[PDB]
Design a protein around this ligand. Structure first.
Ligand SMILES: [Cu+2]
Ligand SMILES: [Cu+2]
Ligand code: NA
Ligand code: NA
Lengths: 620, 620
């Protein structure tokens, strides 16, 4: 019954049928994006209208379309032709991943470049890389991918060990033409292999690890109903999945006594970008919007038991559209389980004689995706005590280059002749807040140091201050770790038993934000990434911090455009957009396959409850 | 055989015997501190000399002594009388915890104060609190404790719910006299109970938690030999225990191929302080050095299985001295176990077809201590990938006060009339570094942003810089989260296969440091807490950032005095002292017993290894 249920194979087939019937999905059409839309505000009272949004590409060169369909009613709600030079190109298509290599393989300029390096064309892999927006006037309105080459010595070889530096090509993937081949000079192609399953490199595998067995003999403590509605230790939510964003959480709420209290209406990673900090012309255009350009959900891994997810696991298998509108299941693409999380609360009291210990747990909802060389795990955690946390786990194989003779200020050395350009991985979490309902506001809270003097004669006092963010023009904020800066989302009309507005406090990691010069193309295209926290007034068309069409799209859309409306956010339906990232100077330990590193944020209750919410957790 | 083995009951009895024989431990003597000393540098070549350091108090008012004993040889090495007005009072004795309440109960000023508030003296608990150093000239050279009162309605009641504000007393615990009773006026004693095992407050306990069973059917992957030598997944270390510092790690090293490579010679929490930020004269003197004044090891809990520590647990039961020199065992005071830690590394490669997943694990060494109202867990983690981490878990019951009518800038409200003064918990980790041996140096590494222009025409480049800390005068450093500041400890004479010095990078949480005015007593006594990172040249008498005797001791010792020597630290035997803390504005959710909150730091290999050290971890 839930209008927040996952899309079914039947719904996708039905979208396909509706589009076909309407004349919108002929043989030259391809689906670049398809997803279910969330219910409108206040829609709970009226019957279901399941609506799907679709981006349709045309392989014959005609203009693409944005279409909204009502699958409930079997109708097209809207269909509009896109001018991509203005509003952006559609996301990269799965079917385009081979095309850059294939076209380049019979291009005389490319062949000449490979022959100069004594490389067999049959062994040269070409990564199909997003192009961005730079100085090349001919690319405006054209679907371009750029290609960087990596040598694969044999079918099972890791090509990332053998980058071909000094060479890049640009390709029109619709007209199937090579627009440019740039060769700045030969660099040695690094020779050592990076085959992390080769016994010669691993050596003898360890025999020292004894098994760890995690079981739940009575099954898990959470229930799943309606396909994707979770109930666990007072928490209530729906687990969505979108081909762009991946796992999306809806209707996060906590049952406090008899009342189901909303906390967050929708939580997602709405963008993620990987900007590279190497000024070589071979890579200086490199910025991968894994979410906006590639669609991270589309590449979600099938997760194997006792392996990717350990313990008593409940899986969801979300369905997405292929390029023709046929449903494709991602088998075991979402893991759900609960985990022990050490001590929750503990006190041994001298005066009462009472010794008390309770254990913590968390509910985990995750998926893992692969974007070329990168693999990322996206983890959402709900804790017994009301805390909500997100963690990203970055692994895979680092993107490589040559390591210049005489070193580099922008590239680290991994192996002889092998470099790894510096880069960042920067995420935007979009948290459509609903603290005890939709009437919310945000305050920035700083620690306040106090001067020794009257009222503070021993110079020990310290305090804090809160500044309400009243309008969008005032709500673009930066971190200040030194002053312990956090942001509190509260409901000014809902008070706890102490007559204080209920709230949740966002605790950031205060990692560096986007490092690029403010006048760069990337600082404009990923403007969201330049500041730690943005707050907007909710609008149904304000979905991504980079806008709907990121591929080859200049600035003009996204968060800077939204906040220009300067809307009231003081006791209104608001959305918090938190930027957080990893700055990666690759280390030798990252090669040939990288150990996981992490980043994230959390939100903790701040006078939301009337006392600890975990007093009813039982012993042992 | 190991000179790093835990102290045995026999060794403590033997220290007692040696002291007795030497005339140093008559009936009026009490042991305030006793611990084994680490072996001298280069001592491995000569036979064992187990030496113990002892602080001896005299209950009849004579001067205390610092004594070093050789238990191996049965001799007193040194014994010196202390002038406590100069060098500090000895740590608070367990036997003094009752004395403040007992003396106050027959004092007419105290009795008058309680009668003004209609409080039955038999129900008034008095916390025995460290005094610090303020304006009271008569306290210099005297052992003083201060007392704050809390009402206990019945034997099992949580007295913390019922603070008696407006009242404080000072007591000489040797002469057994009450020096001052200060009554600034009556405040309502908060009435609601805080009994977190009372069904009236908890409500019906949850029946929704299904069991989680963590077992190791073949036993653990670590070995323990010589009582406390651990070997686990290439790591090697010895687990020490000291009554002051608690768990101390010695000789942390990693077996890389055939070579045992040192990383850290000694790791401990060498101090921890809890400064309070309430300017009321009732509490403005409050700063608890839990380590230096109270001795956190002494109060380590006995940890119950399936409860405090879950899984296949190996315990150590360290032995300490009681006040008379008799050995006392802390049964199951140290937990050791390995834990699954999610995904270690993962890649699904498009070109090779190879899908690869490996799981991570960590070795955990922990203890939990109780200091009055506070309970703290101290956790050390070793990970497969070479990472070393510390985490402190803070829980217990918050220290309370009245909540003033009309609010407070320095106290939060928890319940009707019940306040919690703002405070911090600030730790100092002392890391005697040995990166590939003792010849080490520290660099501060910052991210470097670059301007769009020649050499960087697209404005995408970013870099980093490292500054070697060459002498102690230059090695007192602050955090800079915005620039991604870290500190690298390297060995300039030990290079990896890429001709780079091997190293480890310290990643701080960049939480606020000590907030008190720089001219306060606490800023001087806890000077270490005002800066994030200090580096000293190793010296055997430079053990604690606050010096040997913290109780009622002004500035003059500790880190500021050590670094004045301005010694060479550029390729020398050095020690890193990292300050990290929690700033706590108590929330309603913290009452009546606080959910765990955490702080810590970690160190990750940085070109220490020649490639990933976990390529030999087996599948599944
Ligand atoms: Cu990276
Ligand atoms: Cu605290
Ligand atoms: Na909202
Ligand atoms: Na050292």
């Amino acid at each position: 019954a839930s209008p927040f249920r996952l899309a079914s194979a039947g719904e996708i087939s039905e979208v396909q049928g509706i589009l076909r019937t309407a004349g919108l999905l002929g043989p030259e059409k391809r689906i670049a994006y398809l997803g279910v839309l969330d219910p409108a505000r206040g829609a709970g009272s009226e019957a279901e209208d399941r609506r799907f949004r679709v981006f349709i590409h045309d392989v014959s060169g005609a203009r693409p379309q944005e279409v909204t369909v009502s699958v409930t009613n079997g109708t097209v709600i809207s269909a509009v032709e896109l001018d991509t030079a203005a509003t952006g190109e559609l996301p990269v298509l799965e079917e385009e991943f081979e095309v850059v290599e294939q076209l380049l393989a019979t291009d005389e300029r490319w062949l000449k470049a490979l022959a100069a390096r004594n490389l067999d064309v049959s062994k040269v892999r070409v990564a199909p890389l997003s192009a961005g927006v730079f100085e090349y006037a001919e690319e405006r309105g054209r679907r371009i991918l750029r290609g960087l080459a990596f040598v694969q010595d044999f079918p099972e070889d890791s090509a990332w060990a053998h980058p071909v530096d000094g060479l890049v090509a640009y390709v029109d993937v619709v007209s199937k033409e090579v627009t440019r081949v740039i060769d700045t000079g030969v660099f040695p192609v690094p020779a050592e292999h990076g085959n992390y399953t080769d016994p010669e490199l691993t050596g003898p595998l360890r025999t020292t690890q004894k098994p760890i067995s995690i079981t739940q003999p009575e099954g898990p403590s959470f229930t799943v109903t309606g396909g994707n509605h979770i109930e666990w230790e007072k928490w209530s939510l729906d687990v969505g999945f979108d081909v762009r964003e991946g796992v999306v959480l809806h209707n996060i709420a906590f049952r406090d006594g008899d009342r189901l209290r909303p906390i967050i209406n929708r939580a997602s990673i709405a963008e993620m970008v990987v900007p590279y900090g190497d000024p070589s012309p071979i890579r200086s255009w490199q910025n991968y919007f894994d979410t906006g350009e590639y669609l991270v959900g589309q590449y979600a891994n099938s997760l194997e038991l006792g392996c990717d997810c350990l313990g008593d696991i409940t899986y969801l298998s979300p369905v997405i559209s292929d390029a023709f509108g046929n449903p494709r299941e991602i088998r075991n693409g979402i893991c759900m389980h609960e985990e022990d999380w050490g001590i929750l609360a503990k006190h041994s009291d001298l005066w009462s004689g009472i010794n008390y210990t309770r254990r913590n747990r968390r509910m985990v909802i995750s998926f893992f995706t692969t974007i070329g060389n990168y693999d990322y795990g996206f983890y959402w955690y709900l804790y017994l005590d009301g805390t909500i946390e997100f963690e990203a786990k970055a692994t895979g194989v680092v993107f490589t280059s040559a390591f210049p003779e005489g070193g580099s200020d922008n590239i680290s050395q991994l192996a002889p002749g092998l470099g790894a350009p510096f880069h960042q991985h920067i995420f935007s979490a979009r948290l459509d807040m609903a603290i005890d309902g939709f009437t919310n506001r945000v305050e920035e809270e700083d620690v306040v140091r106090q001067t020794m003097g009257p009222g503070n004669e021993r110079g020990n006092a310290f305090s804090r201050k809160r500044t309400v963010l009243t309008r969008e023009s005032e709500a673009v904020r930066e971190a200040d770790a030194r002053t312990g800066r956090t942001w509190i989302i509260s409901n000014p009309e809902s008070k706890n038993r102490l007559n204080e507005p209920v709230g949740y406090k966002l605790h950031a990691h205060n990692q560096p934000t986007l490092l690029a010069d403010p006048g760069s193309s990337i600082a404009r295209r990923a403007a969201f990434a330049t500041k730690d926290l943005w707050v907007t007034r909710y609008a149904d068309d304000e979905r991504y911090p980079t806008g709907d069409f990121v591929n080859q799209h200049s600035g003009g859309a996204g968060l800077p455009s939204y906040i220009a409306q300067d809307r009231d956010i003081d006791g209104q339906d608001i959305v918090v957009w938190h930027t957080f990232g990893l700055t990666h100077f690759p280390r030798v330990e990252d090669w040939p396959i990288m150990p996981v590193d992490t980043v994230g944020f959390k939100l903790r209750p701040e006078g939301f409850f009337d006392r600890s919410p975990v007093l009813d957790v039982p012993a042992n």
